[PDB]
Amino acid sequence: IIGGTECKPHSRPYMAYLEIVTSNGPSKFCGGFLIRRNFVLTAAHCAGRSITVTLGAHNITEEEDTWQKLEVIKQFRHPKYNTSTLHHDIMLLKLKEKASLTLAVGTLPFPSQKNFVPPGRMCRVAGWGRTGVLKPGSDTLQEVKLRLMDPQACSHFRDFDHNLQLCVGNPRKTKSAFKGDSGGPLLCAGAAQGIVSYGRSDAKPPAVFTRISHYQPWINQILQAN
């Protein structure tokens, strides 16, 4: 997160810290959010050979009792996910066991309300991502308030699609989700409307978020068949 502020410890109990393992490379890290005690929603590009989910964390460098390091039994990457266009950058992670509900760990009510369009211009996103282009991932959970933009603002991302994605972050500001924040939820009025997907390597906002409403039927199918 760039230009954000440290979250009040555990104030976002649904946040998930993912450590992704690959065959020929060091582990990578992403965000995500718990929507069912045994299901975490994140970005499809965060897929790997295996993934470990850490719930109840704030400062991920210091283990604590609130932590729940959970095994992922199966990764459900969206069938239409495309690495060249980055469309359908969404994935569901089924946890081997159902997480414990504590003050620090809880599910994000989803679905919620009923809208094909995310109301409100100001939303908020959190993550443990880099806080700058040459800055490393944050040890603590950071959050920032961002402006939902008209699709025109993301025209420069040639594969951006208003039906499938949200344009987030006033270009006049530095505030933005960044590398390491992928998979994190975009909350508007308390409801998850998007998922951090991608943007410019130079961090100039806005960034592209997966539009959740478009995937409601796919999400319900997966949750129903598992």
Ligand X SMILES: Cc1cccc2scc(Cn3c(=O)n(CCCC(=O)O)c4ccccc43)c12
Q: Which one of the spans 10-18, 71-79, 158-166, 178-186 is the region binding ligand X (CB under 6 A)?
A: 178-186
Instruction: Based on the residue annotation, tell me whether 139 is a catalytic residue of this protein.
Output: no
With beta carbons less than 8 A apart as the criterion, state whether 176 and 153 touch: no
Instruction: Choose the one of ligand X, ligand NAG, Zn ion, none that binds residue 66, judging by a C-beta under 5 to 8 angstroms depending on kind.
Output: Zn ion
Q: Is 187 in the site for ligand X (CB under 6 A)?
A: no
Cα–Cα distance measured from residue 64 to residue 211, given in angstroms and rounded to the nearest whole number: 34
> Which does residue 97 touch among ligand X, ligand NAG, Zn ion, none (CB within 5 to 8 A, set by kind)?
none
Residue range at the interface with Zn ion (CB under 5 A); choices 22-30, 56-64, 82-90, 179-187:
56-64
Which H or E element spans position 30?
Answer: strand 25-36
Bridge partners of residue 68, in order along the sequence:
55
Taking CB under 5 A as the binding criterion, the range among 59-67, 69-77, 107-115, 184-192 that sits at the site for Zn ion is 59-67
3 binds, among ligand NAG, Zn ion, ligand X, none (CB under 5 to 8 A by kind): none
Rounded CA gap, 4 and 138, in Å? 11
Chain contacts with ligand NAG (rule: CB under 6 A): 59, 61-62, 82, 84-85, 139-140
Do 194 and 186 touch, CB atoms closer than 8 A?
Answer: yes
SS (H, E, C) 138-182: CCECEEEEEEEECHHHHCCCCCCCCCCEEEECCCCCCCECCCCCC
CA–CA distance, 140 with 136 (Å, rounded to integer): 12
Q: Is 89 a residue of the active site? A: yes
Q: Rounded CA gap, 186 and 124, in Å? A: 6
Q: Is 45 among the catalytic positions?
A: yes
Annotated catalytic residue, options 58, 87, 176, 182: 182
Q: How many of the other CB atoms lie within 10 Å of CB of 60?
A: 17
In the stretch 63-102, what mask flags binding to Zn ion with x, by CB under 5 A? -x-x------------------------------------
Cα-Cα end-to-end distance for the chain = 33
Which residue lies nearer to ligand X by CB, 95 or 196? 196
Question: What string marks each residue from 66 to 95 as x (binds ligand X by CB under 6 A) or -?
Answer: --------------------x---------
Shortest distance (Å) from residue 180 CB to ligand X: 7
Q: Which residues bind ligand X (CB under 6 A)?
A: 45, 86, 177-179, 181-182, 196, 198-201, 207
